[PDB]
Amino acid sequence: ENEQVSRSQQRGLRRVRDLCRVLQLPPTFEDTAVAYYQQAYRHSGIRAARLQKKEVLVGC
DNA sequence: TTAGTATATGTGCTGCCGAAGTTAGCACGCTTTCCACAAGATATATAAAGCCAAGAAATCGAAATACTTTCAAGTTA
Numbered sequence A: 001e002n003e004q005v006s007r008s009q010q011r012g013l014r015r016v017r018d019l020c021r022v023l024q025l026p027p028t029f030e031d032t033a034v035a036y037y038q039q040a041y042r043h044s045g046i047r048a049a050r051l052q053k054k055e056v057l058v059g060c
Numbered sequence B: 001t002t003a004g005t006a007t008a009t010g011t012g013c014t015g016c017c018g019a020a021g022t023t024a025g026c027a028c029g030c031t032t033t034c035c036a037c038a039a040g041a042t043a044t045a046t047a048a049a050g051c052c053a054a055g056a057a058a059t060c061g062a063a064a065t066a067c068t069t070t071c072a073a074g075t076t077a
Helices: A007-023 A027-041 A051-059
Strands: none
Touching: A007 A027, A007 A051, A027 A051
Protein backbone atom coordinates (compact mmCIF):
# COMPACT_ATOMS: atom_id res chain seq x y z
CA GLU A 1 0.00 0.00 0.00
CA ASN A 2 0.91 3.73 0.09
CA GLU A 3 1.46 3.48 -3.70
CA GLN A 4 -2.12 3.11 -5.00
CA VAL A 5 -3.04 6.40 -3.33
CA SER A 6 -3.95 9.69 -4.97
CA ARG A 7 -2.51 13.09 -4.12
CA SER A 8 -5.94 14.14 -2.86
CA GLN A 9 -6.12 11.21 -0.43
CA GLN A 10 -2.55 11.95 0.65
CA ARG A 11 -3.42 15.60 1.31
CA GLY A 12 -6.45 14.48 3.30
CA LEU A 13 -4.35 12.11 5.40
CA ARG A 14 -1.73 14.80 6.00
CA ARG A 15 -4.45 17.24 7.07
CA VAL A 16 -5.87 14.62 9.43
CA ARG A 17 -2.43 14.12 10.97
CA ASP A 18 -1.79 17.87 11.19
CA LEU A 19 -5.07 18.54 12.98
CA CYS A 20 -4.41 15.57 15.27
CA ARG A 21 -0.98 16.92 16.21
CA VAL A 22 -2.41 20.42 16.69
CA LEU A 23 -5.06 19.09 19.08
CA GLN A 24 -2.24 17.06 20.69
CA LEU A 25 -4.10 13.75 20.50
CA PRO A 26 -2.13 10.53 21.11
CA PRO A 27 -0.74 8.39 18.28
CA THR A 28 -3.51 5.87 18.97
CA PHE A 29 -6.03 8.61 18.17
CA GLU A 30 -3.98 9.50 15.08
CA ASP A 31 -4.06 5.87 13.91
CA THR A 32 -7.80 5.52 14.53
CA ALA A 33 -8.43 8.78 12.66
CA VAL A 34 -6.40 7.75 9.61
CA ALA A 35 -8.07 4.32 9.64
CA TYR A 36 -11.57 5.82 9.70
CA TYR A 37 -10.57 8.32 7.00
CA GLN A 38 -9.40 5.48 4.75
CA GLN A 39 -12.58 3.51 5.49
CA ALA A 40 -14.69 6.51 4.49
CA TYR A 41 -12.58 7.16 1.37
CA ARG A 42 -13.24 3.56 0.31
CA HIS A 43 -16.70 4.75 -0.75
CA SER A 44 -17.06 6.45 -4.13
CA GLY A 45 -19.59 9.08 -3.07
CA ILE A 46 -17.08 10.56 -0.64
CA ARG A 47 -14.16 9.79 -2.98
CA ALA A 48 -15.50 12.02 -5.77
CA ALA A 49 -16.76 14.85 -3.56
CA ARG A 50 -16.12 18.55 -2.98
CA LEU A 51 -13.02 20.04 -1.38
CA GLN A 52 -15.17 21.36 1.47
CA LYS A 53 -16.78 17.91 1.52
CA LYS A 54 -13.43 16.17 2.09
CA GLU A 55 -12.37 18.82 4.60
CA VAL A 56 -15.54 18.17 6.60
CA LEU A 57 -14.78 14.47 6.15
CA VAL A 58 -11.41 15.00 7.85
CA GLY A 59 -13.20 16.91 10.60
CA CYS A 60 -15.89 14.26 11.12
C1' DT B 1 81.35 7.94 -44.68
C1' DT B 2 81.64 9.15 -39.70
C1' DA B 3 81.29 11.88 -35.32
C1' DG B 4 77.99 15.12 -33.00
C1' DT B 5 73.20 15.88 -31.73
C1' DA B 6 68.13 15.51 -30.88
C1' DT B 7 64.32 12.29 -29.64
C1' DA B 8 61.61 8.94 -27.71
C1' DT B 9 62.10 4.45 -25.66
C1' DG B 10 60.76 1.91 -22.19
C1' DT B 11 62.28 2.10 -17.67
C1' DG B 12 62.90 3.25 -13.15
C1' DC B 13 62.96 6.24 -10.05
C1' DT B 14 60.15 9.43 -6.20
C1' DG B 15 56.61 10.69 -3.42
C1' DC B 16 51.56 10.70 -2.94
C1' DC B 17 48.42 10.85 -0.35
C1' DG B 18 45.29 7.66 0.67
C1' DA B 19 43.28 2.41 1.50
C1' DA B 20 42.02 -1.11 3.38
C1' DG B 21 42.09 -2.44 6.66
C1' DT B 22 43.44 -3.53 11.48
C1' DT B 23 43.27 -3.13 17.46
C1' DA B 24 42.36 -8.79 23.18
C1' DG B 25 38.32 -11.41 27.30
C1' DC B 26 31.95 -12.02 29.57
C1' DA B 27 26.68 -10.07 31.24
C1' DC B 28 23.57 -6.65 30.55
C1' DG B 29 21.10 -4.40 26.89
C1' DC B 30 5.87 20.17 -6.56
C1' DT B 31 3.53 21.76 -11.30
C1' DT B 32 0.54 21.93 -15.49
C1' DT B 33 -3.90 20.60 -17.51
C1' DC B 34 -6.47 17.48 -18.79
C1' DC B 35 -10.30 15.46 -18.16
C1' DA B 36 -14.60 13.26 -17.43
C1' DC B 37 -17.45 11.68 -14.03
C1' DA B 38 -20.51 12.63 -11.08
C1' DA B 39 -21.78 16.11 -7.62
C1' DG B 40 -23.35 22.03 -6.50
C1' DA B 41 -27.55 24.21 -7.03
C1' DT B 42 -31.32 24.41 -7.80
C1' DA B 43 -38.39 24.53 -6.60
C1' DT B 44 -41.32 22.06 -2.17
C1' DA B 45 -44.66 20.36 2.69
C1' DT B 46 -43.40 19.56 6.57
C1' DA B 47 -44.86 18.72 11.07
C1' DA B 48 -41.09 19.89 15.00
C1' DA B 49 -37.95 22.84 18.48
C1' DG B 50 -33.53 25.56 19.27
C1' DC B 51 -31.00 29.32 17.83
C1' DC B 52 -29.37 34.43 16.62
C1' DA B 53 -30.24 39.03 15.78
C1' DA B 54 -33.86 44.08 15.87
C1' DG B 55 -37.65 46.30 18.90
C1' DA B 56 -40.71 47.30 23.01
C1' DA B 57 -41.46 47.15 28.14
C1' DA B 58 -39.39 46.67 32.86
C1' DT B 59 -37.05 47.17 36.42
C1' DC B 60 -32.43 48.09 38.75
C1' DG B 61 -29.05 51.93 40.07
C1' DA B 62 -28.56 55.98 41.74
C1' DA B 63 -28.52 61.08 41.66
C1' DA B 64 -30.56 65.58 43.06
C1' DT B 65 -33.98 67.29 46.26
C1' DA B 66 -37.46 67.06 50.53
C1' DC B 67 -37.95 65.39 55.91
C1' DT B 68 -36.22 64.69 60.25
C1' DT B 69 -32.11 65.01 63.83
C1' DT B 70 -28.91 67.47 65.77
C1' DC B 71 -26.25 70.07 67.72
C1' DA B 72 -24.69 74.74 69.13
C1' DA B 73 -25.57 79.43 70.33
C1' DG B 74 -28.89 82.19 71.94
C1' DT B 75 -33.24 83.58 74.19
C1' DT B 76 -37.46 84.56 78.48
C1' DA B 77 -36.74 83.47 83.12
